[PDB]
Write a protein that binds this ligand. Sequence first.
Ligand SMILES: [Mg+2]
Ligand SMILES: [Mg+2]
Ligand SMILES: [Mg+2]
Ligand SMILES: [Mg+2]
Ligand SMILES: [Mg+2]
Ligand SMILES: [Mg+2]
Ligand SMILES: [Mg+2]
Ligand SMILES: [Mg+2]
Ligand SMILES: [Mg+2]
Ligand SMILES: [Mg+2]
Ligand SMILES: [Mg+2]
Ligand SMILES: [Mg+2]
Ligand SMILES: [Mg+2]
Ligand SMILES: [Mg+2]
Ligand SMILES: [Mg+2]
Ligand SMILES: [Mg+2]
Ligand SMILES: [Mg+2]
Ligand SMILES: [Mg+2]
Ligand SMILES: [Mg+2]
Ligand SMILES: [Mg+2]
Lengths: 153, 206, 262
Amino acid sequence: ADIQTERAYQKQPTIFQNKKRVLLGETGKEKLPRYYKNIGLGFKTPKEAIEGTYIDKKCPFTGNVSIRGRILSGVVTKMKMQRTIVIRRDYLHYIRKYNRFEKRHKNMSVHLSPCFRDVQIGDIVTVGECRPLSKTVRFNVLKVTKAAGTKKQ
Amino acid sequence: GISRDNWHKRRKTGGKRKPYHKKRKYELGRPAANTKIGPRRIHTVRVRGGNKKYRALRLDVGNFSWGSECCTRKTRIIDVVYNASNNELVRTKTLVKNCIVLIDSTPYRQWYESHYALPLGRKKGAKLTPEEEEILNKKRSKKIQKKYDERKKNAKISSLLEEQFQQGKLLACIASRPGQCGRADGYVLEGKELEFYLRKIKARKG
Amino acid sequence: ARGPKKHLKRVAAPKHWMLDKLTGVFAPRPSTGPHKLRECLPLIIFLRNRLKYALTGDEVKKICMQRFIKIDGKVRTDITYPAGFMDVISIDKTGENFRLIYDTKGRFAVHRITPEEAKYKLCKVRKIFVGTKGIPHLVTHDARTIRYPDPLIKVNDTIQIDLETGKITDFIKFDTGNLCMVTGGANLGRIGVITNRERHPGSFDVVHVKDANGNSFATRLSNIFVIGKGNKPWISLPRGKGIRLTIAEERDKRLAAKQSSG
RNA sequence: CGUCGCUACUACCGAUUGGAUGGUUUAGUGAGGCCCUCGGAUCGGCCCCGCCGGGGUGCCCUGGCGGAGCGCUG
RNA sequence: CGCCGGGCAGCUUCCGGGAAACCAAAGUCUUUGGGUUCCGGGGGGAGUAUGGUUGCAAAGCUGAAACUUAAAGGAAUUGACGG
RNA sequence: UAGCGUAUAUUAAAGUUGCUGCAGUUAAAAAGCUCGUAGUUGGAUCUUGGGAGCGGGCGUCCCCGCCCUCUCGGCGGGGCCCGAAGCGUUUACUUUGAAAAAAUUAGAGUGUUCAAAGCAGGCCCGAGCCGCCUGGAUACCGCAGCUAGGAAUAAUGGAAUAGGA
RNA sequence: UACCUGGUUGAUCCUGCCAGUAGCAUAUGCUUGUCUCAAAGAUUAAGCCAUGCAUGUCUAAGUACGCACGGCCGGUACAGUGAAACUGCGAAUGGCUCAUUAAAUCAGUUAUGGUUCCUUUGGUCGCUCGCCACUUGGAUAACUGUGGUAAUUCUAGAGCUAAUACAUGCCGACGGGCGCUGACCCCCUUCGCGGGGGGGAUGCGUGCAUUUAUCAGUGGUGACUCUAGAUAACCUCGGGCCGAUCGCACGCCCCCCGUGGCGGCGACGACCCAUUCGAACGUCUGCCCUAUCAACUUUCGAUGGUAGUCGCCGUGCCUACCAUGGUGACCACGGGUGACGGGGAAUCAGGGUUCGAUUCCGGAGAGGGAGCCUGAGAAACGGCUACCACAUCCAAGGAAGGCAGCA
RNA sequence: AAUGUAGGUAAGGGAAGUCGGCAAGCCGGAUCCGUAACUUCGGGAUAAGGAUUGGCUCUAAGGGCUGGGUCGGUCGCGGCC
Ligand SMILES: [Mg+2]
Ligand SMILES: [Mg+2]
Ligand SMILES: [Mg+2]
Ligand SMILES: [Mg+2]
Ligand SMILES: [Mg+2]
Ligand SMILES: [Mg+2]
Ligand SMILES: [Mg+2]
Ligand SMILES: [Mg+2]
Ligand SMILES: [Mg+2]
Ligand SMILES: [Mg+2]
Ligand SMILES: [Mg+2]
Ligand SMILES: [Mg+2]
Ligand SMILES: [Mg+2]
Ligand SMILES: [Mg+2]
Ligand SMILES: [Mg+2]
Ligand SMILES: [Mg+2]
Ligand SMILES: [Mg+2]
Ligand SMILES: [Mg+2]
Ligand SMILES: [Mg+2]
Ligand SMILES: [Mg+2]
């Protein structure tokens, strides 16, 4: 859909849109330049983030968030929230007395950029820690991998 | 007093949290500045670390930048026309960070004539002759006229801004935060943002 | 607490200060200065517990207030001034100079130096930033900042600050094959040569160092102070040349020393 | 082995719309502080200027009483 | 008359186990670990009181405490006794 | 034995809470029976043997050498060499290293008159020693997090409408 | 030291508990010669407190006209010692206690590229073109005198007097340079036009800090919307900096001359940067018992989005508009705790089971709540304000309280 | 005027009046919350209890009708492909 679905005007603060349309510029059509950045740590910025139109101030690639701290992974559980999803991380807790393990889990609400479109329940998402984005969100989805899919019957 | 703590909120699971200490000073809040439009009134408040904050209770002038022309002038704010957060703020004429306001176009007009030597906002002319007759001719030399007619070619202004200049008031978005810095700096709306906000105002009324 | 702490319990003091348990309840609590209190040696314990020039805090206070203690070429009257790493302690009335260097066991040792060597001092640059009017700066491992450095000097290199001027006369790049010293952690006080540097983006780099005897260890990048151009140190090393030797070859050295002295 | 009768002790049910003491709260009232909008008991400056005064020479350099300009101000 | 597989069992055995009765499983357990479910912690009070829940009812499921007690029990042996 | 008794909490005894490591026919105990979701547990199978001198002595023992790729090899054009990029999965596991307050615990040294302690102390002094030698170690620190070797065991995937290399 | 013994029976093998046995940790009983260490109103009542003390502080280097002493060397602003008081700093540390508190505190790990920071140390302090500066104004302490109240560390009126308190405010650098605006002139293709450049009088802004918007891409990160440049402007009268400060010995220049210009060592001070002590909120993992607590949260924020407000900053912290989410048998939610958490302690084959009010670290509280001034730092209580419960004096009009500090 | 019939008000107390709260009085609509014992599980229930309610000036939300053409390559300033 269109990107202006809010009461305010959605735009990237870095890019100046009104670059003096004059005779030397053949208008139209001049595509609006996009702001993006590489986040380091080997993660590549997606092509949808490169040449999309979505405005997301919390997107790791086209927003004002810096990825620093812990890089971890999880499994997508629900996608019912706006621009954010909940993931489940499964781990084994060691109990010394019985020398055995205990199956535990925690649910984390992470922010999902619109640059990731083909996201389904069960996909493995690598997320990175950022500044607090909401009351319960402190992580951004940096990488998405399919769960034995890449094909639809 | 007004507290900005996180421990008065329910847990993510929905459980009720119990405070392990009473309210601390560093997690305080203060009443909203609620910047209106009027003769200048700014109250100094002491903040954490002994630093200073300016509550602009009333403001009438602000520094606004055209952007496309790179002309930044100190102009006068007339009124608030739209606010994305609350319509009550528009009705009460409250100046906040993102509300768009009507500002006087007089300094931008004057810079436009003094830099491009084109009429702007005028209807038929011959109304301010003891001043504009000097700026139309300037009886200048070949090199100065070469500079000026070199600058004439890119002297194109959007029809929306032209209509606003005819009305005598531009509409601009604030960028600073009154009640934190005590001033109302901002930038003149133009382009797709201007079209979006104009359509919003038209849908609101008319 | 409602504010900063200005006390230090005796048992909570840093271990390398070598303080005991029965003298009292409190520790010197060094004042703020060029070095963190965890790896600093306050002048009170330097002149009372290391040199035994003074027997009490009042006596070391008298010594300091008579203006004989000179640190980095400047007279300091603070009883709890944090000396820190390789700051020259100069006493002119008795005419000896001390360089504060960790020993093989990670403790500040009493290292005596000649005046012509005490005239200078090595520093580890901690940050390089350009400030207003486009002026480069340089902040060392101390709190010392200087302007207009050599553009070849990069982060965590070593510079030669001569005293009484505060200027740079030479520098050592952080390069593989240079003599270093570990300034923190388990390997504290070990002199060795930079053999490898593995870097972990978003985390701490790990440097692998081999000493003269061939013992190879590793430490975080923040704990390394380059002290020599390749293998010759630019300063005078303490006893043992910063070679950590195990208890097995320490015990027989003690036995040999006892046999020689008896 | 159980009922029944006597004596102790321990709990249980029980009308009494029982009682007491804590804890958390709805609603009403609401001290006090803080913020905002007023407010103006007083305290100062300029305009002093009824005047003597006045010096580069009625045209004051002002050394003070004095009304108060019945304003502008902080 | 045999052979094979899956069953109901039976006889016998110093496989072995078990307190023994006995059990080819109740064996392969101090030479202790194939996987997994339920469940007991001296005898009474008591499967009682109360709460919850199911039922038309009778009742079913879940299920205490105070207090009391030095034994209560299992298998076998000898004797005594047996309408 | 200058200490000893009593009451109470708690630990061992208690393999009478049993992970190591208990029981469940008759002693207390396996649901009336079956299905069944969470949970827990899941069959076999993918590199083995052949090599050279150092070699737990080819001494047919074997420290042990093993008989990934591509990019400026920093000693636009040398073989005089070893750095920049990635891992032909992701993990669990195991070993190593770092970072992990002190005190306490274990433990090194030290005749506190012995010891509990403490972190001290020792050598000569012929009297001029216009002073010498030291110590104030080390170990452990679960789980979680970081790093580098190994790849047996266990999970997990790659090419099947080829939408494959 | 990887341990057992008595008790059910007429007797025997068991199951099984009771009892015995040893340690430590509280109390108590009896006894007690020496010496070295050493816990000690935690358990009940975080119950209540008389009295006394527990936080004050001056160097040569802010302000001395107190006679309160005193050198005078005697014609002099101030010798000096200094009470009091103003100013500055501290009083937010320490000490006590463990009531609250169950992903809360706390431990390890990591981040603040999402913040503030007194002090120390190091940078920066002629970078700004703009009729007192050989030094500006007023008030107030202390002090004298007049008092009021029963009372207090209560204070009023009147009269003086200072600043590194409170204000005001220059010169010097300072010659100019840079960026716009450009009077006009000159060299110019020359040619009848256009010309390509040089100068330039008159004007407007120039530095750092702040708040916007725009352009380009000296150093640095793994990654900035980093730092540093350039342009346009702002720069808040409860309004940023661009020193009206104080000691120590005292010396140099004299052409102009003859009274001026210079000088060293410090101290104090600062806008900002860096550092140090930190602090604050975050990331991952970890906590006892309970289902006779199975479904919670969400009008009154519960989960998320957008835009703001507020806060030192990131964030439903709060507001407005939207979406209907978020957590649970991998035990949510609720309840209990005779729960402050940890380092640790007892016991000791191995595994474990109990205890950690208690001297170290972290947290919380000061009778119960709540709200604030000051300050860098407090929601402070040996600070204030109000209510509640206690409770002191009173001449009944008022006034003063907080020992879970040491006794 | 009394006495009555019908309708009101009454300080302080609040059923002490009376066989007996007879009579009168209280409550009352709507919106938002919130509702017990017991139960034949349908109810009780408008349980009980609490808050709000005027005027004026605005702001949001909840709908219906038509028309969206890329054009003279042309003549039925208009029409067929
Ligand atoms: Mg099984
Ligand atoms: Mg039983
Ligand atoms: Mg026991
Ligand atoms: Mg048993
Ligand atoms: Mg049985
Ligand atoms: Mg199943
Ligand atoms: Mg298998
Ligand atoms: Mg201060
Ligand atoms: Mg408690
Ligand atoms: Mg504790
Ligand atoms: Mg403490
Ligand atoms: Mg407190
Ligand atoms: Mg308080
Ligand atoms: Mg009445
Ligand atoms: Mg009444
Ligand atoms: Mg009656
Ligand atoms: Mg009666
Ligand atoms: Mg009636
Ligand atoms: Mg009823
Ligand atoms: Mg109304």
